[PDB]
Every structure is written in structure tokens, then in C-alpha cells.
Symmetry: C5
Subunit: 252 residues, 5 copies
């Protein structure tokens, strides 16, 4: 019945949460995998998530189908788009909740781009996916990324706050949003999200491992549930060491 609660049981048993994000292959393509070549291998990602004690991984259906082994809770990211694309931002489902269920997913993921000239297309589709999520008792995790239209600065405190509120209004049981850069403004985003837990979208690799930790601590001060981190772990050679330190910070 309560899907936020189901999400928390599964992805935040310790009261905070670290998700290893891995939809990069479609969203950005494989170029970033070159810094740490093993990252192109989804098997490595599963081992990495498990060895670091993380709460979950995010796979596109193709990766889930060919590689998922049940060893770490899965969020199946249902839509995806490429950076090669030049239109108004849009990302459509390449899979379904029902198929995610049969692949052993514990939750489903969907990106919206509020403000886009295609914002309606994603809301329309989200309606079906939200309905399916409830039907299959799978928490819906919304990546809420305002982009297009009037959006100029994506990390502006008013834009991140709008992102968080939109996700709540649309039925998200958990959400993933960009960091504002400082914990005071980010906590307003966290507040307007209400009962719905907020994960920080990790983003591009930071100059040092130190800068990222400082961000993560900011996020926690603000009251977020934790982080959904991709590049900033698996793009690094010392992925597991750095992952473990992310664990110590977030969990203890």
C-alpha cells in the first residue's frame, strides 16, 4: 500500500541511502567509461555496489536483462534519451513496470524535464507509469530535471525547489534532484518535497574526492535521504575505496 515506506525498507534500511546510478551508457554514452575501463562492464558495477555496502543500482532494462543477478536491489530506469539529441528535452519509456517486475526490480525510475516544450509528453506517460507502479506495488522514483522553456540555471535554488515540488505533486515515492551548491537552499527543496525522500543527483566528476564529500555532507545537513551517485564513484580508479568512504559518511 505505502510505496514510499516500501522504498525506505528496501533502499534505506540504515535510515540513509546510497544508490549507484548506471544509466550513463544511454544518457551520455560510453566515453566516460574510458577513465576507468572496468566501468563499461555492468558486472563490475554490481560487484562495486555490493562490496561498498550500497543500497541499490539503477539500470536501463537492457543492462538489467543481460546482467542483473539479484545481488543488490534494482531500480529499473524506464526512460532514456541521448546527448546526441538536439530538440526540446524529452525522454520516453523504452520499457514497462510489468517487465521491470519480472526482471526482479524493487522500484522503477522515470525522468521528467519540467519546462520543456515536451513537458506534457512526459506527464502523459508518467500517468501510465505511476498507475502501473501502484498496480505492481513498485515505488516510483522520479528524476526531476527542469530543462528547456524558461530554465536557464538548473541548480538555481528556485529551480531545484520547483523540481522537488513537481515530483511530489506528480506521485513520486522518492525523488532525485540536482544539488543547489549549499545546504540552506537545498533544505527548502527537501522541505517542499514533504513526505517524499530526496536523493541528490551525483553529477559530473569533481576536481577531487574531497569536493564531492563536502557536497554530500551539505546534502545530509539539508535533510536529504542520501545520494544517487554514478561517475563520481565508477569513473575513479579507486572506486571501492572512495565508495567505502561515501558509505562511512552517509551511514555512520
Amino acid at each position: 500500500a505505502n510505496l514510499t515506506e516500501k522504498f525506505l525498507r528496501i533502499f534505506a534500511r540504515r535510515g540513509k541511502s546510497i544508490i549507484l546510478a548506471y544509466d550513463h551508457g544511454i544518457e551520455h554514452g560510453p566515453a566516460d567509461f574510458m577513465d576507468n575501463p572496468d566501468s563499461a562492464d555492468p558486472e563490475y558495477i554490481l560487484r562495486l555496489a555490493r562490496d561498498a555496502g550500497f543500497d541499490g543500482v539503477v539500470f536501463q532494462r537492457g543492462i538489467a536483462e543481460k546482467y542483473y543477478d539479484g545481488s543488490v536491489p534494482l531500480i529499473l530506469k524506464l526512460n532514456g534519451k541521448t546527448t546526441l539529441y538536439n530538440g526540446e528535452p524529452v525522454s520516453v519509456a523504452n520499457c514497462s513496470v510489468e517487465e521491470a517486475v519480472s526482471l526482479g526490480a524493487s522500484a522503477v525510475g522515470y525522468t521528467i524535464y519540467p519546462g520543456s516544450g515536451f513537458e506534457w509528453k512526459m506527464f502523459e506517460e508518467l500517468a501510465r507509469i505511476k498507475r502501473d507502479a501502484v498496480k505492481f506495488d513498485l515505488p516510483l522514483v522520479v528524476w526531476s530535471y527542469p530543462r528547456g522553456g524558461k530554465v536557464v540555471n538548473e541548480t538555481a535554488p528556485e529551480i531545484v525547489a520547483y523540481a522537488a515540488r513537481i515530483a511530489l505533486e506528480l506521485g513520486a515515492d522518492a525523488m532525485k534532484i540536482k544539488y543547489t551548491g549549499d545546504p540552506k537552499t537545498f533544505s527548502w527543496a527537501v522541505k517542499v518535497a514533504g513526505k517524499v525522500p530526496v536523493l541528490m543527483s551525483g553529477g559530473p566528476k569533481t576536481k577531487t574526492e574531497e569536493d564531492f564529500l563536502k557536497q554530500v555532507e551539505g546534502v545530509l545537513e539539508a535533510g536529504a535521504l542520501g545520494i544517487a551517485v554514478g561517475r563520481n564513484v565508477w569513473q575513479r580508479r579507486d572506486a571501492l575505496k572512495f565508495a567505502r568512504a561515501l558509505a562511512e559518511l552517509v551511514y555512520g
Copy 2:
């Protein structure tokens, strides 16, 4: 069978009606919530509606799902769009009548933008929602907001009158429209709406509490069923006192 009657029974037992609108989170975003921070909390809105003696609240499905507790009749607002959006005005359903039913809604809401380059998209979708509203015996409340195309002044008396008529034509069992600024032109809108009750869309916060009371006054003079108010209540620090003021005005009782 008669859904306007069902709406009136539920949302206007006293013969007039106040609805506490709260779809703002999606439509405008959370910035407005800063003036009175508790307004960001839907639990506060439910208490506020109940404590003021209001007839209902309007929630988007997400808020309804996570917060609705059955303590005040609910209109589930089915579609929503953002102000970040720049195209021809369009607002698509993010939920369904069937789901609204299971969330305890007593009515459903839907916005149309007559005149928009996308007007057909909303009419197309309203056809399905209207059919579902009848099927689930849930009154359909239409927010009728002419915008785009030839519309320049939204509160023009001819535009508000068109808005009211369009809602009636398309099957609204109750409607919500912008005020013209004066009761004589607004009553023409109310007249062309015929059997379908008209609620005034509250709008942006007025310089003073009494500016808004004067508007409501005129709205009642015109023969409207009442008001769907959002900001002008919950953006104020003294939301209950002022809500209670509106309640004295609208339910009168002389």
C-alpha cells in the same frame, strides 16, 4: 445521475461554496509558499480548510495520495502544467478518474485553455475524462482559462463569458473562471453558464485583505456559487482569521 446536483450537495450544502485550491505546487511552484512557510505543508492546508469550515480542497494526485485524510471533501485536479513551460498553453492529465475515486475524491478537476494552439489536445482528453466522470459518478469541475491564440486580455468580459459558455458546452458540472473586475459583466458570464454553477478563481494575493473581500462581494452579487481560493488565504500569515472572514461573507446567514 445528476452530477451538478451531487456537486451542490457535497460542496455547497449551505447554498454557496468555498473551495481551498492547492494545485499551486505544480502550476506556479513553491516560491509563493515562502510568505507563510506552513503552506508548503498539505497537512496544514487540510487543517486550515476544516478549521475555516470550507467545502473542499483541490489537490493534485501526488498530494492527494500522500496527504488526503478524508477530513474535507476533495476535488482531484487531474491535469497540471508548470510556468517554466513556454509553448502554446497545454495541460495534460497526470492521473485518472478511476484513481481519484480510489483516493476518496468527491469530484474531479480539469483545466482547458480555449484559444490555445493546443486547444484540441485538451478537448480530446476532456472527452475521455468527462466519460469517466459520468461512469464513476464524480462531478467534473472545469477550470476554463482562455489563453493563447487571439486571447490578449484574460479578464475581458467577452473572454470570461466565452470561458463560462465553453465549460457548459463541454460538459462541466461546475466551473471555475476568472473574475471580470465588476459584478455586471461577471453576471453575464454566470447567466451564459446556465444550470452549471460558477466559482470565482481566487488569483494572486491582493494588496489588502479587504480588496479581496470586495471582489468576493461582487462575485456573490453576480450570482456565482462562490469562490475557489488559494494564495489569498494560505499565502497570508493570518490564514484562518481571514478564511473565517470569507466564510462569514460567503455563507452570510443574515
Copy 3:
């Protein structure tokens, strides 16, 4: 089985037909109602149609649902658009044949705009509606109004003729088209309609009552089944009187 015959039996028992059109509330808005304020009231329209001895009324579903009382045969106009709209002409269904049936309609109506950039959109939807009309045994009345694309003069004899032929080709059991201004060219439109009866679209209120009556005689001379009249009746203060004059002319 034969829907044109069903239409004639219901809407033309006297061998000719007058329909009181009342979809104007959506199409043009309520400004026209100001000349004769009672016309804003659909109850007045029903009384007017009945007292004049007319054959039917045309309502949008909202008006049918709230006001229709079975006292005059109903054509439920399925689609509608506004004059506030600025794009390529398009009008989509806001209701269905199945619902019209349950509201006591005796026929359904649908506008197409041949030549529009959106002509395909209406043809696509007409396919579904025509199929439904046959299924529910409800005659389909097609308002055939070439507009957009290459159309410059809507009352041009070649354009009205095309309009009439398109309606026949697409499955209309009865049609409504604009008058050419003279009975010679209008009778070519009537001729290309073949077995499908043609009603004249009444149009904007004429300078004098006699101007209109003379158009109606032209229409009848050309072999049309009659008129679908709106404003030219209900926009006048003497609606019933003038309606009764129209009845004497058309029914004989």
C-alpha cells in the same frame, strides 16, 4: 440499416427539413446571444424549435446533457472548436456516439475542414465516428466546411461542390454546407451529393428577414432538403414569428 432513410423519417417527415442549430456557444461564443438574451437559454431554444414546428435541434453534449428533454429530435454535435483558436482549422470530438445514444440523440454531427493542414486529423477521427454511427444506428450528419490550405473563398461554387462531394465520399448520411449565393451553382453541389440530402448552413444574421427568406427559396429551388438555421432565427427578437414564416416557406 439505411441511415439516410432513418434521418429522413425523423428529420423530414414532411419531405423537407428545418433544423435549429445551437452549437454557437462553443463555436462563436456567447456574444451573439446579447441581441436576444433569451437565446443564451437552451430551454428557450427547445421551446422555440417545438412551437415553430421545426424538425430538430443541434446541441453539443454539455447542453444536451443538462437541457435536452426529448421534446424535439436531437442531433448531437460531437466536435467543437472556438474562434479564439488561431492554428490550421481543426475540431476534435469532445464526446462519442455511444454517449449521444444514451442522451436520446436521433443523429450525430461532425465538422470537417477539407483543405486544412489538419484535414487528416478529422478524417482519422471521422472513421471512428462513422463506424460508431453505423454500430449504434445513428445517422451521421457532416458539416462540410473547406477551410485552410488552398481555400480562399468558402462560398465559391467549386468549393461548395467539393464540400458536398467530400461529405458523400466520407460516409455522411446527411450534410450541411454553405450556400453559393445562387440556386444554379448550389444545385450542382446538390447534384454531386447524390443520394445524400443537403441542408443549407444558415450563417450570420442577414440585414433583413426577406434577404434570408430569399436565400432559402434559392436553396429549395436547387433541390436541397432544407436548412439548418441558427442566428437568423434565435438572434431575432421575433424569433418565433420569423421561425413560423420559415416553416410556411419550407414545408409549404
Copy 4:
């Protein structure tokens, strides 16, 4: 099972075929009916087809529904557009295979415009119609008319050849294409069509009847199954004479 064979059995019992095309009322409008006024009457067209010994007629659903009497095999042309239209060429179905079946059709017809900015819309819809044609055991006749995009000269030999091949690729059981003007290049179009029989699209009424009869002779020797002729028969005052001379030539 084999629909090309069923087509040949019904529309080419003599081993060649003449189809009397009559979708012109929607495609071009009724202006061409003026040269020979009876041609506006579908009843005349059925008599004409039968009296000339032709194999079939092509009707839009409206004309089929109101006029078809089972006296000559029918190809129900499913889609139609107008010349008033100005956008990228598109023609959508205004009817269905299932309804065609119930109207006594022996085959169904569908136009595609390869190259059009809307080419995808027609291929999408063709998929459904092809599936339906197989399901109802009704041969699919594809009018293949490259238009829009890069197409400048429609009767260019490479364009007509492309048109033929596309029809074969998409599932046509018989096809209708424009003549190149000479039997050498037209027989390459016929060759790339493979097992799928090719009918020449008749086109605008030729200056002189011999001008048409020659096209016919070149089409036949190029190895086409025959002709789908409209205006070049029914626009003529000597309609039945020419049709009977067209027959003697096609059937040998």
C-alpha cells in the same frame, strides 16, 4: 492464404485487368465530372464498368455504402485526401478492412506517398491495414505515389521503379503506379515488383484517345497486368465506346 492469387482470380480472370477508378470525388473534387455530367453519378459508373466488361471499380467507403450493388467486384479505397490540402502529402484511412468486408469489397486500397515528410504516418497505418487485409482475406492494392521530400519528377523512371519496389516491400498484393512514358523503363518497374502485379495509374484525360491507347499498349508489353483507369474513360462523352475499345486491347 495467397492474396495476390485471390486478386488475380477476381480481378484478372482473363489474365489481364481493367479497373474503373472512381475515388476522384474526394481526391480532386467534382469539377472533372462537368465534362460528362453522368460521371457524377456512381450508378452510371457501375453500369459503365459492367457494360464495358471491366474487372472492378474503386470506391471510397461513402460511395460504396450508398451505391455498391455487387454487380462488379469492388476495391474499397480506404484512405483519401483532397487537393485543397497544402502540407506534406498525407492520406489517412477514413474506413477499415472489416467494414469493407461487410460492404462486399473483394479487395482494399491504400495510397502511400514515399518521400513525404509524413511517409512514416502512412507506413504506420499501412501496417495495421495489411494485418487486417490478411485477417479478412482481402487482397491489399497499394497505390504507390512518391511525392514530397526529394521527389521532383514523379514519372521519372527511377522514381516509378522505387514506387513499385516499395509497394512489394510493404506487403502489397497488387499495386498501382504511374507510367514512365515509355515501355523500356516501365518494364524495370514491373521487374522490381516481382510476383506482385502492376496496374498503370490512368491519370489526366489525354489529348486524343490514341495517345492513351499507346500508353496502354506499352504498359501491357512492359508486362503490367493492366490499367486502373478513371478520367480517361468517364470524363469522355464517348465513354462506353472507348471503354469497349480499351477492353478489346487489354484482354486480347
Copy 5:
């Protein structure tokens, strides 16, 4: 259950694979068939595939339906577009997995154009097709061709790599991508494809047969499963002899 394995069993019994591609009739049209006229005949293609000992053929549904005889495993290419088309690249299904099954296909094929302004349209459709492929136990082969948007050089190593990764992400069980021109960059594409086998898209006729075989060599060094070759076999007057050479090289 495992569709990649089913694909390998059927199309790569020898551990490597040669597919004879023949969707060109729609994609490019019949002009290329002129160099070796027998190539226009699908019967010749089947004979050619079989006599060369190849693993399969790719047909569009129309060709499969009229010509497929079960003599060589079939991949039914579900979507197709023309070169006459000028818009943002898009190719929609003209057929279905269910129909492919009944035509004796052993796999289904679908093209995506990542980067296109219409990329979402194909991802949307791929979702349905992928689901159908799993349901009917037919391996999905994805032609992954970045085009439109930001794509300028299609054979750029980063673009081909992205192509490969997207195919994996979306659920491809085997994929077909363009060669980079050198085996070092092509093997990065092969690596990011992970468990999903990669076939080289053959492409346009090479200046010399030698140039083609050295590209094939490259492809094999890079660790690809083999080649999907069309024009480079069947456009050659000595098709069979050269095909029998391609065999020798690929299978050892």
C-alpha cells in the same frame, strides 16, 4: 529464455556469422539492383545465401511473405524508410513480431537513429517490439545508426561506440553498427556492447574487393561476431565467388 543464445545457435553455429542483408529495396530503392540485375529477384538472394553457406537473410515483410521459403534462417526487418524522405530520420514498423513468427522468421530487426529529432518515436516503438520479441521468443537485432541532432560523422569512433552501447541499453540481443575504419576503435565499440554480439554493417560497394575483405579482417580482430553484408555481395556480377571468399575468411 536467453535470446542472444538463441540468436547465436541459429545465426552463428560456427562461432562467427554472415548475414545477407536485403532490405535495400525500401531503404535505397532498386537503382543499385542494376549493376547485377538478378539481385532485384529475392529468389536469387535466397539461392545466393544458401550456396555461399551464409547464416541468414534480412527481408522486409513484403519480400518475406512473397518469397521466403525457409531455406535460410530469416531476420524479418520490421521497420523501413526511404532515401526520398527529407525530415529528421525516422523509421516506423510496417509489421509486427507476431506476423514475423507466422512467416517463419528466426529473429526480428529494428533500426534506431539515436540523436534524431525523432529519436523518442523509435524508442517508444522499440519498447513494444522488444516486449513482443521476448513474448514470441524471437531475438531482437538492432540496427543502431546515430543520425541527426549532433551527429556529423557517423563512423567516428565515439559515435559508433555510442551506437553499440545504446543498442545494449535498449535490449538488443544482437546488433548491427557501422565500422570505424580501424580495428582498435572498433574493438572499443565491441567492448561496450558487452554480452551482445556485434555485426558490421557492410555498407556501399568498395572500390576493390580487397578493400572490403581487409575491413572484414579488421572487424574480426576487433572481436565482432561477423558481418551483415548486402550490396558488397549482391551488387557484384561475381557475387557467389566473392561471397564464397567472404565465407572462407569469416568461418576459417
